[PDB]
Amino acid sequence: QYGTDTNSVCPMQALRNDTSIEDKLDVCVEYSLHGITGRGVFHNCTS
């Protein structure tokens, strides 16, 4: 089953923490965040 929230069942091959978003702010990147995938650009925001 796929959930819109975080997906906590992942294979070990997909276990990584390549969270270098600070250096990749101004670039279109492929993101995979807790089972959520897509493409986009991250802008520093306050919330």
Next chain:
Amino acid sequence: NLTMLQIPQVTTGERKYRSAIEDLLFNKVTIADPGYMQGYDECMQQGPQ
């Protein structure tokens, strides 16, 4: 008396572009501001609404 149909003159400042009756008409209608100048930035600074 044609006061409401005329645009009020102002001695100092910015000239007005709406009459009294036009101001009454526009205030009764809710229209969203389509961010002509800085909508792209405002949609990020304001958050989801």
